[PDB]
Design a protein around this ligand. Structure first.
Ligand SMILES: Cc1cc2nc3c(=O)[nH]c(=O)nc-3n(C[C@H](O)[C@H](O)[C@H](O)COP(=O)(O)OP(=O)(O)OC[C@H]3O[C@@H](n4cnc5c(N)ncnc54)[C@H](O)[C@@H]3O)c2cc1C
Ligand SMILES: Cc1cc2nc3c(=O)[nH]c(=O)nc-3n(C[C@H](O)[C@H](O)[C@H](O)COP(=O)(O)OP(=O)(O)OC[C@H]3O[C@@H](n4cnc5c(N)ncnc54)[C@H](O)[C@@H]3O)c2cc1C
Ligand SMILES: Cc1cc2nc3c(=O)[nH]c(=O)nc-3n(C[C@H](O)[C@H](O)[C@H](O)COP(=O)(O)OP(=O)(O)OC[C@H]3O[C@@H](n4cnc5c(N)ncnc54)[C@H](O)[C@@H]3O)c2cc1C
Ligand SMILES: Cc1cc2nc3c(=O)[nH]c(=O)nc-3n(C[C@H](O)[C@H](O)[C@H](O)COP(=O)(O)OP(=O)(O)OC[C@H]3O[C@@H](n4cnc5c(N)ncnc54)[C@H](O)[C@@H]3O)c2cc1C
Ligand SMILES: [Cl-]
Ligand SMILES: [Cl-]
Ligand SMILES: [Cl-]
Ligand SMILES: [Cl-]
Ligand SMILES: [Cl-]
Ligand SMILES: [Cl-]
Ligand SMILES: [Cl-]
Ligand SMILES: [Cl-]
Ligand SMILES: [Cl-]
Ligand SMILES: [Cl-]
Ligand SMILES: [Cl-]
Ligand SMILES: [Cl-]
Ligand code: NA
Ligand code: NA
Ligand code: NA
Ligand code: NA
Lengths: 454, 454, 454, 454
């Protein structure tokens, strides 16, 4: 079997859909091939909250942002290990990318709602209607059907076709036991995401990312795009830069949204009954601290007073039922009960909370310098939850320029090969700021399809 | 009609009940005479939250307070216009007074709950069961009945009886049109409270305390004790030092508890549609600012987001129904609606909230330096409330020493005359810190009855 | 003897010179009569630092101020007891007043230097060349000589001349034992300053302003203008609102500039060897706290480390020589020496500094919440200084409107009578912010002369 | 040539001298072999400031520290990548190590002086007399001569002698072209320091540590100990964790102490005339930001106002003369001059400083959130300096247990082989806190000699 298009995009996430739509919009034949039976990848189960400095939503609310502030926030976030030109091009194209989603893809964002992720000087993350990436992916596939962009599911790319001159001329994929050849007259776009769900690749670049980390993403995020491109001598950088989330379900690895009480006074307790880290540190700092505790897990503990402010138990009854059923979460009346259900030394826990109560009563956390201020925990009932970290984002990946052209190890452009999204590795640095991944995949996805189409 | 006791106490508030119980406990005949048909005065409708440094409740929760911190908090609160010896004696006797209420009067405080009023470095205010002064007054009258302390209601003291030597030998009161003579063999205790409900006396020492201020207290607080004592040449000081609460009902003058959203993001708006004061300033600073606005009133405005955190609308449905019925509070869907219901200039209000939204999105209130941080007000619905200040506490009053003995204008002790509670004027200074009035009346009430009984 | 002018100005300070120059500029005869043998009054010995929002100096440095911020800073500073219309007119005319001094009077301000007084959200106080009011007064008298504005020194106004209709028609003054009559065809301007140097008038409106307060001003500031105007039934308000400076020479009453180490780590110690107030509180709060300590004085203590940062000893050798000669300041090698020279209990002082050293080593002042952070005092040598407060500014005075017209007790305009400067009492409220007095006297001085000339 | 001792220590730094003295103190023959012609290594040119929680100096000053705070400060500093047992053993033995230096080695620390490095909650770093490591090394060699500990300079260890059973039985060294055999009957101690001066080894574990980084250390710090131990199959970990200092001389690589004005208001400017990083960020964050600027260097700029507070120009005249002579530092009168001497775009620099002046005048750095507050730079003269980062500390190295026993790659103890100091790699993590390296080398140096001697 043999297909021939101008642009062959691998991956039906946000990056691939943007590349595919821009290629078709330029008057070229394109196709998206998707390995999974469903479209969307991690972009589907994502919050799809998009950081934009100068958005129409900010103007509606009276918020004045700045592109240079957005740029410096992102660079300082990755400890200046990110590429300044890649960050600048992302920030400079964020407004146009968000307006493109609103006007071309018909994505509906909330007009009077934004979120401020950690490390952002100004609240700037747009929120899609429904607080889900499905709003974006549904509008993408609807738009793709209107413009005639075919999406081939259950089609796994396995080999890049390189001709005598070194130009990438197509993709060899597997569909229904059979070898499909995808001839790409103009370019191939690699939009395959990261490898957070590839434990053996994780260990290769960081032996500590073994079973003590879960994955917050889908099963398909296995880094196929990096292995494919490297076999034709593409460069990969920063493969060890990995973003984690510290409070995840030990069973599934998913982010434990019921433990968002951490932002309202919840404390992290280890098996000894002690606090060990500021609950509002960087996500990677908290995960590393959790892995230094006995057993490599932590407890999350709060009371009704905090729930009356956070409402995380009320807003996430599914997690409440699952965690309690699996024996990883209890609701108890007293701190003594909270200790015994998890065999925490009672006297050491009572003394720990007493210190928290004192820190709350004087405004200073003498133990870990809580930057918001601890909250009294004298009254119950209490919720106590057991959590472990999970790998969230692989900042490393393929080496590209600001035109998404893939470079080899000497830094030379590989003709016909483009990459955008989490599969690239030059934008974020050592820490991926919240809401920045979606700005990255839409901005560079659009560029990839525009560059591939010429 | 003629009565003869050892100690005659005027006033059945917290100060009088403490004096009466201590006098009877010393083996002397005593009586409390009360002008109103009910007992309790302002102590009854009070929150009865009592500031104590070193209380058993603090120890239960692990909080470590300090008496010197409590002393310096109180002195700095009244801008060091209070008497240092009066503050020291109050703080040094706070633990014994609170334990006396718990052990002798059988007052029930919460074991795991405290409140931190403004200006207190450590959370230290005890809370009675039920969050009401009725818990204290009910236990007082029960204890008074057990120990044989008669309380004569509908008996208004009108003249102090002074003998040839200048000693105060009794009280002349009015009961049922008739003149009752109360012979006091050992002492008279003046425990009549303040004059927050005496508008003409308020204007005498501050012409600005006219109809633009309400009263948060009961009708009986009219300063009878100061006029009585001054006619036998007792000294009064600081009569102009008055404590106000800025957000009160324009109809009743009571504290508007539904407007506690001020501590969660609610903004104060004047008739022009502008903010004019930091919403977390001192209570006297906010009241003075409110009286500088057009009409001498202010608006309080918040939204569902704040109610989801403050719950003040849910916890005070009575105020919601009354304020809305009286046309002083509206729930609306949009800010445009919030402007029109009170004829606030719409464009100026929309621009004001836009600035608040920007201040919330950047953490800095460039207009009034909100010390907690403003909260976004882009989404509705909204509550908007009209409020005016009310006189809350008259810090001035009779001149006493730390033994509650009343002094004349040369500072000499008037024999047989004692005073305790809000009727005295040397403890608090220019600003009465929250929870400090109850520590004052119990500590010095007990001293008055002990000194009067000898 | 008899003189006849259009406008007769009483007082050769900043307010009078502005009124006199504006009257002459309008084509009218004017005269300034001065009681002292020298011109300038308190405006001469002043720092002459002038608060201006939107000044050319701010623009030179890149600082963006706001008039509404300036207005709200001033109003919140006087606890909203100031007149909002008087503050608004002062702030709105501050730029024009400062430009008038620079362009008409030829006052030289520094182009790249400003000062930020307490309570100002933005650094906005202009600084005259030489850091002295003599720069302003010298340029005033030079300009007055050029425009023909006669100044009569040794001429004390003692009575306002009021005609049959109630119009103020002139001034009766005393010069060389003889009664001079000053006929004022258009108006009289009262520009006599405050009464900080009138102890008996101070006690009249505040019995606490006796010998325990000095005066930072000149001997002529005795409130003659208020007594004069009140005898023709002018209104005076807020006479008890007084501004103090806490750290002054006990001998002279002048501000102790060598004790500006307070802004760099110096601590205030009482006779018991203890701290008693946050060293960075409001000036009135510190003065009141000083008067609550044993003896009604305080000690100021710092070391070479602070001098290496503050340089106050180096920059004020005159005060160093005078205070040391008078036995009110010592330089010692050890804290033990610092205790014995003033008979401070040594053990209590050593423990106090140990607490300061701990507070400095942890960043939190647990005793008084030092808002800048204490500085270690382990090493010497040390300077220790004895200081007492002094009355600095009398915010009260004559009642005027925003056109400087004097009002009677019913609030009615007294024809021909105007007042400007510290002699008026409606601008500042309960606390006069630094740099605001000079904006007040120039803005309203100019208005007085313009209104008097018509 | 052949020598036989019980313990053979390689390296005459702080770690080796501690091991050697403890071995001799246990009654065993020992020797220190030193590759350089001088003793001391990096410990000699070090500040020798030693972090100790609970030191006698803290007690002298009244400072109360905590070992658990010290532990959590160190762990959070290295982002919890350090070994918790290695940090705990260091902190728990810090007091005994410092007292050992004071009492046994006779090191003189200041009794009333400490320093607080970044990331330490309490000021805790002891300071040796003279502010130099030479105070420690001089006392070490004096003590070594008294106890008979021979030190062989110009003797470079090149091969570890391993016997048939795998036990490390001695050292083969080179002295004067000849092969010296050092038989170690009990143990060998590797105390060779780090590899900050080994550029090719630096690039091996981090290709970015090339010529754009200097070295702040001596020429001998070339990682010989790691290569030696790895050839007998010892494990090395974290070799990429490197500590940098951002402001160093481009010529020598030494830390530019004259640029300590950064802690007083100095700003970092790139070639474009812009700020690019908060001047008070982490040292690694600033270095990475400097390498992202045009040319991979930065400028440091301050004025006389800051020098009047920092005194860094006055205290470091040698650097002033050298940097100016080499054309890497200028003193100029105006900002225009400061731009032209380094060909910085003048208009962009003037606008940058104007923003700083505004940020200083309002207290908020809107561009990079300066945590101390910027300082006005309107007036000159100015100093402007060109600086580049240098590698300061190699946190990685040999794998040991808390008894300094070297482990192989399966984690098994290699008999007779011990290591202590910067040559080990498990203590500090990703960021070496200031003053922590000296606590590490003394505590584990002592342990090494005690363990080697048995
Ligand atoms: C739970 C969660 C919440 C998140 N929330 C946010 C948020 O609020 N804001 C934000 O900015 N970021 C968020 N992120 C991260 C962000 O959404 C992702 O980094 C981003 O969606 C990556 O998009 P992508 O198109 O590059 O990859 P993907 O969306 O993962 O697309 C890759 C696709 O390619 C397919 N594919 C892979 N290999 C092959 C192959 N060999 N052949 C064919 N197809 C292949 C995959 O199956 C997948 O469908 C979140 C992530 C998670 C897991
Ligand atoms: C709504 C409200 C809430 C408060 N909450 C708190 C709080 O949480 N914490 C706190 O510390 N303080 C609080 N206060 C203040 C504090 O409760 C009062 O200052 C205190 O109760 C005064 O007690 P008292 O015994 O001195 O006076 P009162 O309790 O007022 O007693 C005086 C009594 O004497 C009677 N009397 C007066 N004149 C005569 C006369 N001529 N003859 C006979 N009887 C006479 C009066 O009728 C009255 O019954 C609150 C006050 C109010 C109004
Ligand atoms: C040491 C010091 C420093 C200060 N620094 C500052 C500062 O930096 N910034 C700031 O804004 N403010 C400052 N002030 C305050 C401010 O300078 C004064 O409030 C202001 O100068 C008052 O000016 P005026 O013209 O109203 O009064 P004055 O300048 O005092 O003028 C009044 C004049 O009228 C004369 N007079 C009085 N009665 C009579 C009479 N009956 N007949 C004739 N003449 C009479 C007086 O002798 C005097 O010459 C300072 C004050 C002092 C004492
Ligand atoms: C300028 C500077 C200032 C510092 N200031 C501080 C501070 O204030 N506080 C702090 O805690 N830390 C500070 N440090 C860091 C700290 O001093 C060092 O990490 C520490 O001194 C390392 O000691 P060491 O004994 O392990 O290594 P070193 O002191 O370097 O000793 C190693 C010795 O072994 C020798 N050697 C190496 N290889 C061989 C071989 N093959 N054969 C024989 N001999 C060999 C070397 O020549 C050297 O003499 C500073 C470092 C520098 C560069
Ligand atoms: Cl085909
Ligand atoms: Cl398009
Ligand atoms: Cl890499
Ligand atoms: Cl009887
Ligand atoms: Cl009793
Ligand atoms: Cl009074
Ligand atoms: Cl004439
Ligand atoms: Cl003019
Ligand atoms: Cl008045
Ligand atoms: Cl031998
Ligand atoms: Cl020893
Ligand atoms: Cl490693
Ligand atoms: Na990536
Ligand atoms: Na009172
Ligand atoms: Na005045
Ligand atoms: Na190391």
């Amino acid at each position: 079997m043999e297909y021939t298009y101008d642009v062959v995009i691998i991956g039906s996430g946000g990056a691939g859909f943007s590349a595919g739509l821009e290629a078709i919009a330029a008057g070229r034949s394109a196709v998206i091939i998707e390995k999974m039976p469903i479209i969307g990848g991690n972009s589907l189960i994502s919050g799809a909250e998009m950081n934009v400095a100068g958005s129409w939503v900010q103007k509606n609310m009276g918020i004045t942002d700045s592109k240079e502030l957005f740029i410096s926030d992102t660079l300082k976030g990755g400890d200046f290990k990110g590429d300044p030109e890649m960050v600048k091009t992302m920030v400079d194209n964020a407004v146009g990318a968000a307006e493109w989603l609103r006007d071309y893809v018909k994505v509906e964002f909330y007009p009077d709602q934004l979120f401020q992720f950690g490390g952002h000087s100004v609240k700037r993350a747009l929120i899609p209607k429904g607080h889900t990436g499905a709003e974006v992916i549904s509008k993408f596939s609807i738009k793709a059907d209107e413009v005639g962009l075919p999406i081939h599911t259950n089609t796994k790319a396995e080999k890049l076709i390189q001709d005598q001159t070194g130009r990438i001329v197509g993709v060899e994929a597997a569909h229904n036991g059979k070898t499909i050849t995808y001839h790409a007259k103009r370019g191939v776009v690699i939009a395959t995401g990261g490898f957070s769900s590839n434990m053996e690749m994780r260990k290769k670049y960081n032996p500590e990312l073994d079973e003590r980390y879960g994955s917050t993403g889908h099963a398909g995020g296995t880094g196929d795009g990096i292995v494919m491109a490297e076999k034709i001598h593409a460069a990969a950088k920063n493969m060890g830069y990995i973003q984690s989330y510290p409070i995840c379900s030990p069973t599934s690895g998913a982010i434990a949204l019921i433990a968002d009480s951490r932002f309202f006074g919840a404390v992290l307790i280890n098996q000894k009954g002690e606090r060990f880290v500021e609950e509002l540190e960087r996500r990677d700092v908290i995960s590393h601290a959790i892995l230094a505790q006995p057993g490599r897990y932590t407890y999350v503990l709060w009371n009704q007073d905090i729930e009356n402010v956070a409402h995380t138990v009320e807003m996430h009854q599914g997690e409440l039922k699952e965690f309690t059923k699996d024996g990883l979460m209890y609701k108890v009346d007293t701190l003594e009960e909270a200790a015994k259900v998890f065999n925490i030394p009672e006297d050491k826990l009572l003394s720990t909370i007493k210190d928290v109560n004192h820190y709350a009563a004087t405004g200073k956390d003498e133990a870990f310098n809580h930057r918001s201020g601890l909250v009294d925990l004298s009254k119950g009932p209490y919720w106590i939850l057991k959590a472990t970290p999970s790998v969230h984002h692989t900042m490393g990946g393929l080496v590209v320029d600001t035109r998404t052209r893939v470079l080899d190890e000497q830094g030379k452009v590989i003709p016909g090969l483009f990459a955008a999204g989490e599969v690239t590795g030059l934008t974020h640095g050592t820490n991926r700021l919240g809401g920045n991944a979606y700005t990255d995949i839409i901005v560079y996805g659009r560029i990839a399809g525009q560059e591939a189409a010429k």
